[PDB]
Ligand binder design. Sequence first.
Ligand SMILES: CO[C@H]1O[C@H](CO)[C@@H](O)[C@H](O)[C@@H]1O
Ligand SMILES: CO[C@H]1O[C@H](CO)[C@@H](O)[C@H](O)[C@@H]1O
Ligand SMILES: CO[C@H]1O[C@H](CO)[C@@H](O)[C@H](O)[C@@H]1O
Ligand SMILES: CO[C@H]1O[C@H](CO)[C@@H](O)[C@H](O)[C@@H]1O
Lengths: 143, 143
Amino acid sequence: PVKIGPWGGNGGSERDVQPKPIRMVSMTVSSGAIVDAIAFTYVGTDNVQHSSGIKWGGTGGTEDTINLDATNYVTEISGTVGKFGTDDIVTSLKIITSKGVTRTYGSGTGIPFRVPVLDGGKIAGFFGRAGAFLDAIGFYITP
Amino acid sequence: PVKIGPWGGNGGSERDVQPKPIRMVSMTVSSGAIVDAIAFTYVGTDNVQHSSGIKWGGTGGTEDTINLDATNYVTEISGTVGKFGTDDIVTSLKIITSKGVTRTYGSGTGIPFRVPVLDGGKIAGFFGRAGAFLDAIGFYITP
Ligand SMILES: CO[C@H]1O[C@H](CO)[C@@H](O)[C@H](O)[C@@H]1O
Ligand SMILES: CO[C@H]1O[C@H](CO)[C@@H](O)[C@H](O)[C@@H]1O
Ligand SMILES: CO[C@H]1O[C@H](CO)[C@@H](O)[C@H](O)[C@@H]1O
Ligand SMILES: CO[C@H]1O[C@H](CO)[C@@H](O)[C@H](O)[C@@H]1O
């Protein structure tokens, strides 16, 4: 995959997956006022299915899961980076799939970021930073 | 390549290349107060070298060319989208290469965008919108 990002603040602890993802199977976002945590399931470059492990971020918010397949894949993610308390974090995220559904996580504000993937490309997974919340998010993308 | 973006306003006319780029050979940005135009040279998916054609945007600004090769490639582009007159355009662009040189085009402000490419990935080319100026910029990226 291509690896781009992340978007967000410098706090929390680094997060990534080994091996790198080639296809995302599911993703789970934990959120409330802002984005608390993220987790996902993927097929790696080893052609095996993996978990990203325990979620990246705290125990706050509520979980929501998106299940992906050959015709239902993530084509756009956008969001905002702003304060929640003293830290710059991911204060909102919006996920758009190839079947035209939008999910929105968080209700926060700040500086917008947007990654529209065109021509059949798709988000294959995530990396970033997280502590109590999701400080920063980055993407693995396949054409 | 992966195709992502664009970042900018809805004005000007659509711009793209056929065939799609797999490797960027050079890029030329025209700029003054803001970004006036962009052009580049690339190797296509047809494994031939191509021009992007006449520049995308107006006759304003001054040209600056970056020449790329196997060890000197674009690893990050950032910029801002803001007003110049009545239109939202690309008011600044910053290009960073694998040899650690930064070029900055434009002196404008507005909403920032940033695409850091990690792990040896690189910008392979551009698409977007342009009229008198560079209304919007998007990127082709290879891992
Ligand atoms: C403000 O409190 C709410 O938002 C935070 C941040 O999203 C969550 O951790 C918490 O559980 C609540 O839902
Ligand atoms: C509450 O502090 C923790 O959480 C914030 C937000 O995630 C991080 O910035 C910080 O480094 C800690 O990990
Ligand atoms: C404000 O005028 C300057 O900036 C504009 C926009 O970049 C250019 O077109 C022009 O030639 C000048 O350099
Ligand atoms: C001056 O008007 C032209 O240039 C601006 C800026 O590029 C475009 O938005 C617009 O559509 C026209 O093409």
